[PDB]
Amino acid sequence: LEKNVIATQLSEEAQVKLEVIQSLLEPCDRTTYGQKLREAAEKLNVSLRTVQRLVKNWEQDGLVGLTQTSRADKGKHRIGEFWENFITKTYKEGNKGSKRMTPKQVALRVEAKARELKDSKPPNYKTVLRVLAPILEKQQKAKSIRSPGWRGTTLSVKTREGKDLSVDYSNHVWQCDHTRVDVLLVDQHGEILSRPWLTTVIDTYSRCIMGINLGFDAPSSGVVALALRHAILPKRYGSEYKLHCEWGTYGKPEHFYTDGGKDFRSNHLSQIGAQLGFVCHLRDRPSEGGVVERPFKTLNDQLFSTLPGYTGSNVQERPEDAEKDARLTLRELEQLLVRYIVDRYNQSIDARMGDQTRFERWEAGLPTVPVPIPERDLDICLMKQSRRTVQRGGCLQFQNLMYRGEYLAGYAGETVNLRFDPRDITTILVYRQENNQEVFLTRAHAQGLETEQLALDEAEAASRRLRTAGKTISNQSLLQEVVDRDALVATKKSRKERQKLEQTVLRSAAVDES
């Protein structure tokens, strides 16, 4: 084991004592000790015994023997031990759970106990503040602790299962999460809508952003599936994005690492994982998600805080003009956000490295050039209805719609896996199991509405209105209920319901991409 003490900058009295010690450092003759000790007593204006004591402190200890020594009672209160423990316990107990008691309130409890004990001289307010001083101080360091982070090139990710998985190359481990964007948006007229949701997908080996989905829709496994589709497929943008670089990323993960939200623990994402072959993993804590969490802070600082309609990070920062100053449509925010991610964010230097651009680290990081996946083969993203049973005459029933198709009647009594798109359920793909291998059977079409379209949400909402009204349900009556609601909304003086208008602007951006 080891120990040492070193003097800090000497005080002026300690400097003088240093000159006296140097005056007493040379001699070898008892006569010269006597001479220089007596002149040192005169120089310090002290007794000869005092100079002897000073030399002995510098002999048995360092320069810290000729600096002053602090008192033994420094940091001990002179009030009784009962009172110091009473003040300490009263403060701590006053803060259990939701309660928040101030030192002044503690002082009132001290005075109340003093009346019970008939103590004419209890600790006053300043003494209570001093007694609680270190208790309040420690707290202020514990809240502020910095984490070292990782040093680079070697990285692993801690899962909620307690397992640590390494990250070895680009597209080894993707991560994803959603946020509100801190910007208010307007419709194509200039009336306010909502703050949109931004979903990002990001590669853990390179920190390069793989894809995004920006829209008014609340988070869902459908939103995660749209974001995976954009991440995975090769990307191209028209001149209206004004890009100078290309996003240039594509291909599919080996693992997908997420929060514990229902969106990522949904059966829909699990079916996407099994078809594309990328097992999912839940993060242990939000602090393990640093690679996906931090980019939202970076976007707030570099991008969103400069745009009209900025709402601040939270209500306490909200500019009073945030609703007076909203101007961007969703299509215009996406033009800005994609220019930023392609020309700026993915072109910045990768932290934990300093040598490499984030994209260059993705591209050089690849084990091999990934083979592009044809867009039609992201049909895997369709939801599966785990079974339906082929009824007599080849019918299937799904969400109250009745479907028939080109071969189904030969399979009556079997169970088939319907695979469907929630954006348009008027046609469904039917798959069956043969030799424990799922195979394609046919496309099934909702009888009598093959020329229409219906999202699953329209069919579900119209079905509730039919059940509430007490009317029967069939393909024609369900279709009539849907087109009648859109006609009734068209009679409204605003033609607005929040979702109908947010969907109109979102769909207008979605179908302007081509």
Add this chain to the structure above:
Amino acid sequence: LEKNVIATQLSEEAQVKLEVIQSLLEPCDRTTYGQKLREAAEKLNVSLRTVQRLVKNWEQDGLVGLTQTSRADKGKHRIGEFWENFITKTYKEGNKGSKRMTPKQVALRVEAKARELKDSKPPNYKTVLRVLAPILEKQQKAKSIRSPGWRGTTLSVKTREGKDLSVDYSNHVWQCDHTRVDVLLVDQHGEILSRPWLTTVIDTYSRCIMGINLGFDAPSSGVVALALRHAILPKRYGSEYKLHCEWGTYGKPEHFYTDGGKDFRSNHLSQIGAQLGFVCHLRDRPSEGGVVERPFKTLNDQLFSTLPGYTGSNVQERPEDAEKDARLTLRELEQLLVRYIVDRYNQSIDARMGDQTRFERWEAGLPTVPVPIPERDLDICLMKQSRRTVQRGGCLQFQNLMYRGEYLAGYAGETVNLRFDPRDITTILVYRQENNQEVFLTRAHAQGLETEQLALDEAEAASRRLRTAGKTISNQSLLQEVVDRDALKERQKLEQTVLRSAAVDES
């Protein structure tokens, strides 16, 4: 103007110059003074001309003439004006409206313009911070500015009319506004309800709290009417409040001063004010009404922060256990809050004075002891229906309910002023205009409901349900649309039940 300057912290070099000047205070002779200069040139390691300059700097400035003055460039920037104006206005434009541009982002705009102009030395980010530094300190100072306060016995309350009310004595100007308390309360079963609303009525002259209302209920001209009657009437509290002094505070204001909430700028408070004879006055800014507002910080600091279920003053300071650690019901919180106001707060020192309690100053500050008003005469709190007309058959129809009155058939076709209680609309007081004055006529009653009590929000909720149910309008039909929804829960009804249990304990 006068123009003086004084030196401080002189010594560090200057004591050597000071000792030189002390050696030179007198032109003793042309022969000897030159020798004193040539001697001082040993203490300062410098020529005769440096010592002659030192003596001239001393004689023309005094002690600051010993100290080295700061350079003329101090606080000026060498980057040139173009860049100094570009950097200053870029920051300012980028923090316009909702934008909050950082100096780093300003530096990026500097590099962008320098690239356009083919400059080679666009100011460095460290110098951008320095150039923007002065206009950041100003912003921080302009937020931090303290205001003094009324000092002594003289006080002039500013209104939105630019008129000031001179507050001369107790009950001259009361004040009121509302706020949330910062504690989550529970029902009598221990499940979460919501954070109550607290109303306070204060007298401006004494700063004594003259009345309160605490409840889950919403700010409304009803909650203001209830705060008014609790303030005006003599106060009684039982032993379960454990009070050791009395809230001996009552009587009628001459003026009532408020924020612009719809509770206060309302016909209902106008009619209360005209019948009680007090004038309604509007607060010009939140910062004029500190006598109402500041009771609320003191209560957070002295009372509510020390109670379980405390929620903080805002969402960034919310204790994460607040939703799990709630324990008090509305009846406990009132039994604590009333004690706090009677034993502590009204008994503490009036801060403007230092030598009176808030209650002592109120009681001594009355121009005379006011007579207690009869509890029946607080029927001026009853809401007014201004212009309903008597139908043939001696009838009045009102919020779907139909009413019959003892002389009312004499006045079919005439117009009547109806006074009613939102807590109990089974009965209506009917007044009519005669000789251009109101005269009382009769106590009309909802026919077939004389044994029954309906509050206005129940008749309203029953009417909404009845309209949407497609059933007919009648006194029972409305009662039928109450008694099921009664018997069969929704937070507002659960809140109302706990609020009712407190009102029961008031009886």
Add this chain to the structure above:
Amino acid sequence: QRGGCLQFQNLMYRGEYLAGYAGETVNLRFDPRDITTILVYRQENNQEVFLTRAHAQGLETEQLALDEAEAASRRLRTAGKTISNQSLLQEVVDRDALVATKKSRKERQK
């Protein structure tokens, strides 16, 4: 830093008994001829007190001198400066500033 870590010359140093001092300030002493190991001292009223040793982590085994670590650090700074806030990284800043500015729709009436 947590777990008893210190940063010096861009290397990360781990202290042997240091972990209880996270969030505290310490001072430190080393021989410029070899900065693979650093001596950590606590600060007190007139004295530094020797606290523990600390060793460099993630580096090569060969003993690291101080001048050599400065050199490694200027090679990183030189490499970073080759990506000289390079023009792509700024060209965006005008167009971000000019999709805004152009959209003055906050209060436009007829």
Add this chain to the structure above:
DNA sequence: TGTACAGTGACAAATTATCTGTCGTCGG
């Protein structure tokens, strides 16, 4: 003149470990 409670600089008093004299004791 918005406002009033809790936290914070500035100063004074009682207590105690620490530095100084003076003398006595022991060693060279």
Add this chain to the structure above:
DNA sequence: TGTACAGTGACTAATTATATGTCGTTGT
């Protein structure tokens, strides 16, 4: 070992108003 950007001490280079000599000029 969460994660990566904006603000910040600590040090250095370029520019300048300023302190120091040296001599010429004038007043005493």
